[PDB]
Amino acid sequence: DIVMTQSQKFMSTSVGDRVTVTCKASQNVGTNVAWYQQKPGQSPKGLIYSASYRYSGVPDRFIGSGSGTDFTLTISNVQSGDLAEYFCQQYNNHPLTFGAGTKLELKRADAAPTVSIFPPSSEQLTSGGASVVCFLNNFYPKDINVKWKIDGSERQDGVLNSWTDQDSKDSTYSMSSTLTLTKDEYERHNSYTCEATHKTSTSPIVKS
Amino acid sequence: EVKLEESGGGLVQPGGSLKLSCAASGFTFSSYGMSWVRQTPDKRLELVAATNSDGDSTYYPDSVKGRFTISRDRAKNTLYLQMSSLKSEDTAMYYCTRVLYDYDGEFAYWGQGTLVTVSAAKTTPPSVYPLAPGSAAQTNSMVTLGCLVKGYFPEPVTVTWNSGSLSSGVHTFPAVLQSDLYTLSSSVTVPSKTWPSETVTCNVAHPASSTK
Amino acid sequence: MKGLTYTMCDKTKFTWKRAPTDSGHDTVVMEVTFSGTKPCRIPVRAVAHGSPDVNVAMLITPNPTIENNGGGFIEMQLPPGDNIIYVGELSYQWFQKGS
Amino acid sequence: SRCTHLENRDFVTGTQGTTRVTLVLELGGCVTITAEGKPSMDVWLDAIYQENPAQTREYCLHAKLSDTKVAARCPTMGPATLAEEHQGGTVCKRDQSDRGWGNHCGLFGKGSIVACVKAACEAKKKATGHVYDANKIVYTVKVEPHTGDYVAANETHSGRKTASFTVSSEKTILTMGEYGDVSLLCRVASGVDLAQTVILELDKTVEHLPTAWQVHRDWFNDLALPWKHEGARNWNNAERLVEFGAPHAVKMDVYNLGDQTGVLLKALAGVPVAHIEGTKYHLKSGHVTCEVGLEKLKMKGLTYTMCDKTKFTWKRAPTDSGHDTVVMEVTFSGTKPCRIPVRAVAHGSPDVNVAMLITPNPTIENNGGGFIEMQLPPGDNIIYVGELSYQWFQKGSSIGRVFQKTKKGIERLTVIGEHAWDFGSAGGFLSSIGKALHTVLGGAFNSIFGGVGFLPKLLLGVALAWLGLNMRNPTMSMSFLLAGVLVLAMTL
Ligand SMILES: *[C@@H]1O[C@H](CO)[C@@H](O)[C@H](O)[C@H]1NC(C)=O
């Protein structure tokens, strides 16, 4: 099958700038060009076909080019409604293979995170378990450390990382952190503290 | 307003069978064509069954060739996908599509999409836990909230904060696969004056067994 | 044959690269430019005059497929009379001149 | 209505069950399709053209000669040659002069001579033939319903839907406003026989002439004028506008011979014409077989009232329309829009409605309605419009209309009518058997003679008829009948 490799995996841009996304092809497919725009939870949008045509409902903000192996989806005037996932596609071959998805991002500075580490209350001690809950919020870029300080002891047990799309209001990224213990291990250690070390800011910021 | 309402999203074990539908509107049927496209949870798209206008014939990639049966209806506005012998990696967002007048391979309008999780083990429900801090330091601009959805199987999820009142500064996590179990979390950001004075209780309404 | 594990093509993306003409031996030749979902069984059909129900396209190239670098040439023998040779939505008015 | 703008108007009725109306639209005809329960459909072939078809042999009319060189030799002193004997576009003739001792030969008698010219032409004196292509010829069909409006020829009609038909078209779903959709399925190759159609073209910039013409291929290759092709410099068979004479030992004068605008076009007995408008070579004669599906049509104003019985100011009075149909124009200034109280009662029975309408559901509209054509039985026909009657008489006869349809069976079954037996709709034992017994006739008569001419038609007819009378064998005495077809039939 003809693979469609996007060179731009995780790219960022400003509001007023014009950027473009390219896409590889295993062989010369020519004018079998197709792109998309899907937001998380919402639908994709079949914007441009054959690299130069549109559908009624697509503005002049979305142009395109590229006939052959390398394609071109140039977008001018990147709105708040362009914070989405851009797919690649050839419709030459059967099957009509797809791109993994270009997550277009909004440009934002390097910020410091915050943690509200919450040990379990009396509502979870009935079930016999105690799952201590951490949060890493409000940080750019995505590179951040997830660790635990159970009386300051290093513990890789309880590192579960999930990603989150850039926020429409706050423009942040998120990486999860959650611990799974019992009632006995809850009653063996007093101080509970979660660690969040940003790429630039090397300080764990805590409610100790 | 062109609408493609997906339906038939259930929870069936591997080697099972489903029957998808798609309520179509805003376009005449036989002038266009209808197809299915799936999206894996790790953001890698994949075709299910692309097919032309008028119900002439059916295509399948060699991953699913000879097992499924895509069919249609003109006046009733329903795209079917009679599936059978489910692979365990068929857990993917199935999308009803709408190809153009020219049948361009790509699909101009789309639908909201459903999730047909093909999971091995039987389903388990989570519980609700609006937790609270113990040993603790001084006030800040904002101190975020906490609730955990743990010990459940399997996705999807619907979690909000206080029936949608406090939604300023959300941080939603879809899923983390861990030992045939998932575990997500969510956030909302208020100052240190709001938490002890007012009351905050998270909502765990997870549609694995659809309970609270 | 070649192209039995493929599908029927699009109806739209067929355009005449080449004009359907008579061979001098009672067959009609052509060549299409299909720039879409390749390769696939071309929907070649040709009705007659007096009954628009029945396809009467006695083919000479069976199972035409527009390959990734190949395909296009289709030849068919037809009974006398008016004949609408469809290649998808694209059609062609033809009179078979032989008796 | 375009059907009122000409004489050759033919009401193909839509009988109950007949929904796929096979027609033959001539170029310069108009078939109103009145189906019982459908809007009436004025359907007509508008134009037959092609956007600059290929050309064939062009023919110089007015020749032009220059560079005339004459050379002779004595009888036994090596007969004459010239460098222009074998140059392009040069017409020469070797001939025997009578070489005297005036130009000082050795002998008398037959000395050779040759003289050549440059057989050129005059500008804009080319008879440019054109053959149409089967793949680029366009048949234009305009269709108009009966909205109650009448629009002239110098105006244009609003709902006049136009359908073009090429080699890559099958079926034209024409939306008839609120009347619905009409479906015309025309077939191009079963129309004008394009294999032997030469669109001959002279100077169109001459103001007082036609623009295109229409002639036949066989005669076109029987033209003995000098010819060439597109880009070919010199004239093939250029010895036809160039002739020679007899010299007197020195100079044979190769005479210029002139122009041919009269022998071609002016003394010539019964040949048709065509038209050019810019870059489309139109025709004026034609025919094409179309199937007309009325299945998506409906009448307009079925959920309205009837109008007043009094207020109808006659903007146009009813008159006889040459075809036993009666038109009118009511102007209604009351409660619009409404269905017009149209009736025409029987004579001898004053109750019975006999108004065989043509415009179905006559309705005055917000800005339209009024033109109500109807066909009537012969004699007394009392055309009410509500209580305000335009009391009326029609001049036809009962068997006169039937005999009129026999006269249409005479004149429409002409050379056009050899193929146009689809005036009805799949007649079975009326149409198919007719096609058989007339394909064997028209095929045989187009085969024999190749066209012979009316004077040879009557000469050969009366000659073989005399061989019918002067015959010994009673079995071969049917030569009077076999010649009888040649005398009686093809003399119109
Ligand atoms: C059509 O001809 C009539 C009669 O001369 C004239 O009154 C009318 O104005 C003409 N209409 C147009 C559009 O030329």
Short mmCIF file of N, CA, C and O in Angstrom, two decimals, chain A residues 34-36 38 41 43-49 55-56 85 87 89 91 94-96 98-100 103 114 116-121 123-124 127 131 133 135 137-138 160-164 167 172 174-176 178 191-192 207-208, chain B residues 32 37 39 43-47 50 59 61 95 98 100 102 104-112 129-137 142-148 150 170-176 178 183 185-187 189:
data_model
loop_
_atom_site.label_atom_id
_atom_site.label_comp_id
_atom_site.label_asym_id
_atom_site.label_seq_id
_atom_site.Cartn_x
_atom_site.Cartn_y
_atom_site.Cartn_z
N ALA A 34 -5.84 14.93 -0.96
CA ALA A 34 -6.93 15.06 0.00
C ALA A 34 -6.42 15.43 1.39
O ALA A 34 -5.42 14.88 1.86
N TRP A 35 -7.10 16.38 2.03
CA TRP A 35 -6.76 16.85 3.37
C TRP A 35 -8.01 16.90 4.25
O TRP A 35 -9.13 16.75 3.75
N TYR A 36 -7.81 17.10 5.55
CA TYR A 36 -8.91 17.19 6.51
C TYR A 36 -8.62 18.18 7.64
O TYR A 36 -7.53 18.73 7.72
N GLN A 38 -10.14 17.99 11.68
CA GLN A 38 -11.03 17.47 12.73
C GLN A 38 -10.62 18.02 14.10
O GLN A 38 -9.44 18.02 14.45
N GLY A 41 -13.75 15.41 19.45
CA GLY A 41 -15.18 15.30 19.71
C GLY A 41 -16.07 15.70 18.54
O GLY A 41 -17.21 15.24 18.45
N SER A 43 -16.36 16.73 14.05
CA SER A 43 -16.15 16.02 12.78
C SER A 43 -14.94 16.53 11.99
O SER A 43 -14.51 17.67 12.17
N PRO A 44 -14.38 15.68 11.09
CA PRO A 44 -13.46 16.19 10.07
C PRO A 44 -14.16 17.06 9.02
O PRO A 44 -15.39 17.13 8.98
N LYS A 45 -13.35 17.69 8.16
CA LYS A 45 -13.82 18.57 7.09
C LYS A 45 -13.00 18.33 5.82
O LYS A 45 -11.82 18.67 5.76
N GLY A 46 -13.63 17.73 4.81
CA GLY A 46 -13.00 17.46 3.51
C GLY A 46 -12.86 18.74 2.70
O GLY A 46 -13.66 19.02 1.81
N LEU A 47 -11.81 19.50 3.02
CA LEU A 47 -11.64 20.85 2.50
C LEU A 47 -11.29 20.88 1.01
O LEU A 47 -12.06 21.39 0.20
N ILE A 48 -10.14 20.31 0.67
CA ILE A 48 -9.55 20.46 -0.66
C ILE A 48 -9.39 19.09 -1.31
O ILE A 48 -8.82 18.18 -0.71
N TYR A 49 -9.89 18.97 -2.55
CA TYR A 49 -9.66 17.78 -3.37
C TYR A 49 -8.95 18.18 -4.66
O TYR A 49 -9.20 19.27 -5.20
N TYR A 55 -15.19 22.92 -1.54
CA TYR A 55 -16.62 22.68 -1.40
C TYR A 55 -17.27 23.96 -0.87
O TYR A 55 -16.60 24.78 -0.24
N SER A 56 -18.56 24.15 -1.15
CA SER A 56 -19.30 25.31 -0.66
C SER A 56 -19.44 25.23 0.87
O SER A 56 -20.07 24.31 1.39
N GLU A 85 -7.01 18.94 14.10
CA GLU A 85 -6.11 17.89 13.64
C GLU A 85 -6.26 17.74 12.12
O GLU A 85 -7.36 17.49 11.62
N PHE A 87 -5.52 15.81 8.72
CA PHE A 87 -5.16 14.51 8.13
C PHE A 87 -4.65 14.66 6.71
O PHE A 87 -4.95 15.64 6.02
N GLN A 89 -4.23 12.27 3.00
CA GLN A 89 -4.89 11.17 2.30
C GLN A 89 -4.50 11.15 0.83
O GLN A 89 -4.48 12.19 0.17
N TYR A 91 -6.13 9.22 -2.54
CA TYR A 91 -7.24 8.41 -3.05
C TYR A 91 -6.91 7.80 -4.42
O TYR A 91 -7.81 7.40 -5.17
N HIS A 94 -6.07 1.68 -3.89
CA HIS A 94 -6.91 0.92 -2.97
C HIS A 94 -6.01 0.10 -2.04
O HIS A 94 -5.21 -0.70 -2.54
N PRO A 95 -6.11 0.26 -0.72
CA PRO A 95 -7.04 1.18 -0.04
C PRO A 95 -6.56 2.63 -0.05
O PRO A 95 -5.36 2.89 -0.13
N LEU A 96 -7.52 3.56 0.04
CA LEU A 96 -7.20 4.98 0.15
C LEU A 96 -6.63 5.26 1.55
O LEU A 96 -7.37 5.58 2.48
N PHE A 98 -4.29 6.83 4.75
CA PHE A 98 -4.43 8.10 5.46
C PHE A 98 -3.15 8.54 6.15
O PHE A 98 -2.23 7.76 6.38
N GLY A 99 -3.12 9.83 6.49
CA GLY A 99 -2.06 10.41 7.31
C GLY A 99 -2.42 10.21 8.77
O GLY A 99 -3.59 10.05 9.11
N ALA A 100 -1.40 10.20 9.63
CA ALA A 100 -1.60 10.02 11.07
C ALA A 100 -2.35 11.20 11.71
O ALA A 100 -3.25 11.00 12.54
N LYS A 103 -1.37 17.90 14.23
CA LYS A 103 -1.97 18.71 15.28
C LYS A 103 -1.38 20.12 15.22
O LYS A 103 -0.28 20.37 15.72
N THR A 114 1.37 23.84 38.21
CA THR A 114 0.86 23.87 39.58
C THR A 114 0.24 22.51 39.95
O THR A 114 -0.30 21.81 39.09
N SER A 116 -2.19 20.44 42.94
CA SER A 116 -3.01 20.26 44.13
C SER A 116 -3.10 18.76 44.42
O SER A 116 -4.05 18.09 44.02
N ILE A 117 -2.06 18.24 45.07
CA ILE A 117 -1.99 16.82 45.46
C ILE A 117 -3.01 16.51 46.56
O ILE A 117 -2.96 17.09 47.65
N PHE A 118 -3.96 15.62 46.26
CA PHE A 118 -5.05 15.28 47.18
C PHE A 118 -5.00 13.81 47.61
O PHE A 118 -5.28 12.92 46.80
N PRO A 119 -4.63 13.55 48.88
CA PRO A 119 -4.83 12.22 49.46
C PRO A 119 -6.32 11.87 49.65
O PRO A 119 -7.15 12.79 49.71
N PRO A 120 -6.66 10.57 49.74
CA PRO A 120 -8.07 10.19 49.93
C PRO A 120 -8.69 10.57 51.27
O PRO A 120 -8.04 10.48 52.31
N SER A 121 -9.96 10.98 51.23
CA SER A 121 -10.74 11.33 52.41
C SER A 121 -11.50 10.08 52.91
O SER A 121 -11.20 8.96 52.48
N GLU A 123 -14.46 9.03 52.23
CA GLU A 123 -15.35 8.42 51.22
C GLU A 123 -14.73 7.20 50.50
O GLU A 123 -15.48 6.38 49.96
N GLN A 124 -13.40 7.09 50.49
CA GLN A 124 -12.70 5.96 49.85
C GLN A 124 -12.21 4.89 50.84
O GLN A 124 -11.98 3.74 50.45
N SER A 127 -14.27 1.53 51.02
CA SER A 127 -13.94 0.49 50.03
C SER A 127 -12.65 -0.29 50.31
O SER A 127 -12.37 -1.27 49.62
N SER A 131 -6.43 5.85 46.82
CA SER A 131 -5.78 6.25 45.58
C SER A 131 -5.48 7.74 45.65
O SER A 131 -6.40 8.55 45.55
N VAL A 133 -4.33 11.30 44.43
CA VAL A 133 -4.57 11.92 43.12
C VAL A 133 -3.73 13.19 42.95
O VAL A 133 -3.84 14.13 43.75
N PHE A 135 -2.14 16.19 39.93
CA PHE A 135 -2.43 16.90 38.68
C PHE A 135 -1.24 17.74 38.23
O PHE A 135 -0.63 18.43 39.04
N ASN A 137 -0.89 20.65 35.57
CA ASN A 137 -1.70 21.55 34.75
C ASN A 137 -0.92 22.83 34.42
O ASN A 137 0.06 23.15 35.10
N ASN A 138 -1.38 23.53 33.38
CA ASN A 138 -0.87 24.85 32.99
C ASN A 138 0.64 24.86 32.70
O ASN A 138 1.42 25.50 33.42
N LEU A 160 0.99 7.31 35.21
CA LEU A 160 0.09 7.08 34.09
C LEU A 160 -0.11 8.40 33.36
O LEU A 160 -0.72 9.33 33.89
N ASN A 161 0.42 8.48 32.14
CA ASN A 161 0.48 9.72 31.38
C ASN A 161 -0.50 9.69 30.21
O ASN A 161 -0.48 8.77 29.40
N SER A 162 -1.37 10.70 30.16
CA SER A 162 -2.26 10.95 29.04
C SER A 162 -2.11 12.40 28.58
O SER A 162 -1.90 13.31 29.39
N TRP A 163 -2.25 12.60 27.27
CA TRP A 163 -2.07 13.92 26.67
C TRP A 163 -3.41 14.63 26.52
O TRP A 163 -4.47 14.02 26.66
N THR A 164 -3.34 15.93 26.25
CA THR A 164 -4.52 16.78 26.13
C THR A 164 -4.25 17.84 25.07
O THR A 164 -3.15 18.39 25.01
N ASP A 167 -5.76 24.21 24.87
CA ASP A 167 -7.05 24.75 25.30
C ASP A 167 -7.43 25.99 24.49
O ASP A 167 -6.57 26.78 24.11
N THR A 172 -3.08 25.66 27.13
CA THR A 172 -2.17 24.83 27.92
C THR A 172 -2.12 23.38 27.42
O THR A 172 -2.89 23.00 26.55
N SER A 174 -1.56 19.17 29.13
CA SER A 174 -1.72 18.41 30.37
C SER A 174 -1.17 16.99 30.28
O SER A 174 -1.31 16.32 29.25
N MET A 175 -0.55 16.55 31.37
CA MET A 175 -0.04 15.19 31.52
C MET A 175 -0.51 14.66 32.87
O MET A 175 -0.22 15.25 33.91
N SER A 176 -1.26 13.56 32.84
CA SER A 176 -1.88 12.98 34.04
C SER A 176 -0.87 12.35 35.00
O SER A 176 0.27 12.05 34.65
N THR A 178 -1.50 9.70 38.58
CA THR A 178 -2.43 9.05 39.52
C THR A 178 -1.80 7.83 40.18
O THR A 178 -1.12 7.03 39.52
N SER A 191 3.08 12.48 55.25
CA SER A 191 3.11 13.54 54.25
C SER A 191 3.02 12.97 52.83
O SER A 191 3.79 12.08 52.46
N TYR A 192 2.08 13.50 52.05
CA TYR A 192 1.93 13.13 50.64
C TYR A 192 2.14 14.33 49.73
O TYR A 192 1.55 15.39 49.92
N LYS A 207 1.90 21.78 47.25
CA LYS A 207 1.19 22.02 48.50
C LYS A 207 1.69 20.86 49.38
O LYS A 207 1.12 19.78 49.37
N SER A 208 2.77 21.11 50.13
CA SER A 208 3.68 20.06 50.63
C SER A 208 3.09 19.00 51.58
O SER A 208 2.90 19.23 52.78
N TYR B 32 -25.19 10.62 -4.58
CA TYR B 32 -23.93 10.50 -3.85
C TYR B 32 -23.64 9.04 -3.47
O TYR B 32 -24.36 8.13 -3.88
N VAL B 37 -15.35 5.06 7.87
CA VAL B 37 -13.94 5.31 8.19
C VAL B 37 -13.76 5.19 9.70
O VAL B 37 -14.52 5.79 10.47
N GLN B 39 -11.15 5.36 13.27
CA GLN B 39 -10.03 6.08 13.86
C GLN B 39 -9.60 5.37 15.14
O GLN B 39 -10.39 5.27 16.09
N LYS B 43 -4.73 7.87 17.53
CA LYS B 43 -4.72 8.82 16.41
C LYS B 43 -4.02 8.29 15.14
O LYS B 43 -3.09 8.92 14.61
N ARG B 44 -4.47 7.13 14.68
CA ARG B 44 -4.08 6.58 13.38
C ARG B 44 -5.34 6.13 12.64
O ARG B 44 -5.99 5.16 13.04
N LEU B 45 -5.67 6.86 11.57
CA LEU B 45 -6.91 6.64 10.81
C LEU B 45 -6.80 5.41 9.92
O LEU B 45 -5.70 4.97 9.56
N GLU B 46 -7.96 4.86 9.55
CA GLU B 46 -8.04 3.63 8.77
C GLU B 46 -9.41 3.49 8.09
O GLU B 46 -10.44 3.75 8.71
N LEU B 47 -9.40 3.09 6.82
CA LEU B 47 -10.64 2.86 6.07
C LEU B 47 -11.28 1.55 6.50
O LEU B 47 -10.58 0.57 6.77
N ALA B 50 -15.02 1.67 1.83
CA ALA B 50 -15.34 2.68 0.83
C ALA B 50 -16.11 2.03 -0.31
O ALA B 50 -15.74 0.96 -0.77
N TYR B 59 -15.97 -2.50 -1.29
CA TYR B 59 -14.52 -2.65 -1.09
C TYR B 59 -14.18 -2.91 0.38
O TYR B 59 -14.82 -2.37 1.29
N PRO B 61 -10.29 -3.38 2.71
CA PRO B 61 -8.85 -3.66 2.78
C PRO B 61 -8.60 -5.08 3.29
O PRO B 61 -9.49 -5.67 3.92
N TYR B 95 -16.94 6.38 11.74
CA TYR B 95 -17.52 7.61 11.21
C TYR B 95 -18.33 7.31 9.95
O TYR B 95 -17.84 6.69 9.01
N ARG B 98 -19.78 11.14 3.87
CA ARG B 98 -20.58 11.67 2.76
C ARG B 98 -19.62 12.12 1.66
O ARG B 98 -18.97 13.15 1.79
N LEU B 100 -18.58 13.42 -2.20
CA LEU B 100 -19.11 14.52 -3.01
C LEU B 100 -19.93 14.00 -4.21
O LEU B 100 -20.10 12.78 -4.37
N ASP B 102 -18.85 14.33 -7.21
CA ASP B 102 -17.80 13.77 -8.07
C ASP B 102 -17.20 12.45 -7.55
O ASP B 102 -16.40 11.84 -8.26
N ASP B 104 -14.98 11.97 -4.86
CA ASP B 104 -13.56 12.36 -4.87
C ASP B 104 -12.63 11.49 -4.01
O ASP B 104 -11.46 11.84 -3.82
N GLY B 105 -13.12 10.36 -3.48
CA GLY B 105 -12.33 9.54 -2.55
C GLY B 105 -12.46 10.08 -1.14
O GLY B 105 -12.87 9.36 -0.24
N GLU B 106 -12.09 11.36 -0.95
CA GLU B 106 -12.37 12.08 0.29
C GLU B 106 -13.87 12.33 0.48
O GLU B 106 -14.66 12.14 -0.44
N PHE B 107 -14.23 12.78 1.67
CA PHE B 107 -15.63 12.95 2.06
C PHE B 107 -15.86 14.35 2.62
O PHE B 107 -15.25 14.72 3.63
N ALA B 108 -16.74 15.11 1.97
CA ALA B 108 -16.92 16.54 2.28
C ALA B 108 -17.54 16.75 3.66
O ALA B 108 -16.89 17.32 4.55
N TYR B 109 -18.78 16.30 3.85
CA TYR B 109 -19.41 16.34 5.18
C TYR B 109 -19.32 14.99 5.88
O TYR B 109 -19.07 13.96 5.25
N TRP B 110 -19.51 15.02 7.20
CA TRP B 110 -19.22 13.90 8.10
C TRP B 110 -20.30 13.82 9.19
O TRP B 110 -21.31 14.53 9.12
N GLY B 111 -20.10 12.93 10.17
CA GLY B 111 -20.95 12.86 11.37
C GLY B 111 -20.17 13.01 12.66
O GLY B 111 -18.94 13.11 12.65
N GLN B 112 -20.90 13.03 13.77
CA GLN B 112 -20.31 13.17 15.11
C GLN B 112 -19.47 11.95 15.56
O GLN B 112 -18.52 12.09 16.32
N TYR B 129 -15.57 10.00 43.85
CA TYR B 129 -14.65 10.37 44.94
C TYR B 129 -14.18 11.84 44.83
O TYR B 129 -13.15 12.12 44.23
N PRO B 130 -14.96 12.79 45.41
CA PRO B 130 -14.51 14.19 45.54
C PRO B 130 -13.56 14.37 46.73
O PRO B 130 -13.99 14.69 47.85
N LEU B 131 -12.27 14.19 46.48
CA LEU B 131 -11.27 14.10 47.56
C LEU B 131 -10.89 15.47 48.13
O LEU B 131 -11.34 16.51 47.62
N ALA B 132 -10.08 15.47 49.20
CA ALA B 132 -9.69 16.70 49.91
C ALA B 132 -8.26 16.63 50.46
O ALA B 132 -7.77 15.55 50.79
N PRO B 133 -7.57 17.80 50.57
CA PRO B 133 -6.19 17.83 51.07
C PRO B 133 -6.06 17.64 52.60
O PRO B 133 -7.02 17.87 53.34
N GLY B 134 -4.86 17.24 53.03
CA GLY B 134 -4.53 17.09 54.45
C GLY B 134 -3.46 18.08 54.89
O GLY B 134 -3.77 19.24 55.19
N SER B 135 -2.21 17.61 54.93
CA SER B 135 -1.04 18.46 55.23
C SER B 135 -0.79 19.38 54.05
O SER B 135 -0.81 18.95 52.90
N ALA B 136 -0.52 20.65 54.35
CA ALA B 136 -0.89 21.71 53.42
C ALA B 136 -0.22 23.07 53.72
O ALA B 136 0.04 23.41 54.88
N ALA B 137 0.03 23.84 52.64
CA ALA B 137 0.73 25.16 52.65
C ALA B 137 -0.12 26.36 52.16
O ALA B 137 -1.30 26.21 51.81
N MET B 142 -4.82 30.47 42.20
CA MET B 142 -5.79 29.38 42.04
C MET B 142 -5.22 28.07 42.60
O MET B 142 -4.02 27.82 42.52
N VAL B 143 -6.11 27.27 43.19
CA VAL B 143 -5.80 25.90 43.62
C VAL B 143 -6.86 24.99 43.02
O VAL B 143 -8.04 25.09 43.38
N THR B 144 -6.44 24.12 42.10
CA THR B 144 -7.37 23.28 41.33
C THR B 144 -8.03 22.17 42.17
O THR B 144 -7.63 21.92 43.32
N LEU B 145 -9.03 21.52 41.57
CA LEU B 145 -9.86 20.50 42.25
C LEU B 145 -9.41 19.08 41.91
O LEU B 145 -8.48 18.89 41.11
N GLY B 146 -10.06 18.09 42.51
CA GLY B 146 -9.69 16.68 42.31
C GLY B 146 -10.81 15.66 42.47
O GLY B 146 -11.57 15.68 43.45
N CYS B 147 -10.91 14.78 41.47
CA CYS B 147 -11.73 13.58 41.55
C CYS B 147 -11.13 12.50 40.66
O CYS B 147 -10.51 12.82 39.64
N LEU B 148 -11.29 11.24 41.05
CA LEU B 148 -10.70 10.12 40.32
C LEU B 148 -11.75 9.12 39.87
O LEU B 148 -12.66 8.77 40.64
N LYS B 150 -11.59 5.43 38.91
CA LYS B 150 -10.68 4.28 39.01
C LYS B 150 -11.45 2.96 39.13
O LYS B 150 -12.60 2.94 39.56
N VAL B 170 -10.54 23.62 32.47
CA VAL B 170 -10.67 22.16 32.42
C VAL B 170 -9.41 21.50 31.84
O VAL B 170 -8.73 22.09 30.99
N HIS B 171 -9.11 20.30 32.33
CA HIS B 171 -7.99 19.49 31.83
C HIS B 171 -8.44 18.03 31.76
O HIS B 171 -8.26 17.26 32.71
N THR B 172 -9.03 17.66 30.62
CA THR B 172 -9.65 16.34 30.44
C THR B 172 -8.66 15.34 29.84
O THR B 172 -7.98 15.64 28.85
N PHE B 173 -8.60 14.15 30.43
CA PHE B 173 -7.78 13.04 29.94
C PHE B 173 -8.71 11.93 29.41
O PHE B 173 -9.62 11.51 30.13
N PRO B 174 -8.52 11.49 28.15
CA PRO B 174 -9.37 10.41 27.62
C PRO B 174 -9.22 9.05 28.32
O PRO B 174 -10.19 8.54 28.89
N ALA B 175 -8.01 8.47 28.29
CA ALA B 175 -7.78 7.11 28.78
C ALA B 175 -6.30 6.78 28.93
O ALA B 175 -5.45 7.34 28.23
N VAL B 176 -6.00 5.86 29.86
CA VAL B 176 -4.68 5.25 30.00
C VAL B 176 -4.87 3.74 30.15
O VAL B 176 -5.38 3.28 31.18
N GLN B 178 -4.01 0.22 31.16
CA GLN B 178 -3.15 -0.36 32.20
C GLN B 178 -3.74 -1.67 32.74
O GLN B 178 -4.71 -1.64 33.50
N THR B 183 -7.95 4.43 33.53
CA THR B 183 -8.02 5.40 34.63
C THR B 183 -7.78 6.80 34.08
O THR B 183 -6.69 7.08 33.56
N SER B 185 -8.67 11.30 34.67
CA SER B 185 -8.93 12.36 35.65
C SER B 185 -9.41 13.63 34.95
O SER B 185 -9.42 13.69 33.71
N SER B 186 -9.83 14.61 35.73
CA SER B 186 -10.23 15.92 35.21
C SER B 186 -9.94 17.02 36.22
O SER B 186 -9.74 16.74 37.40
N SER B 187 -9.92 18.27 35.75
CA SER B 187 -9.57 19.42 36.59
C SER B 187 -10.54 20.58 36.41
O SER B 187 -11.25 20.68 35.41
N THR B 189 -10.28 24.93 38.00
CA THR B 189 -9.40 25.83 38.75
C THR B 189 -10.15 26.98 39.41
O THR B 189 -10.71 27.84 38.71
#
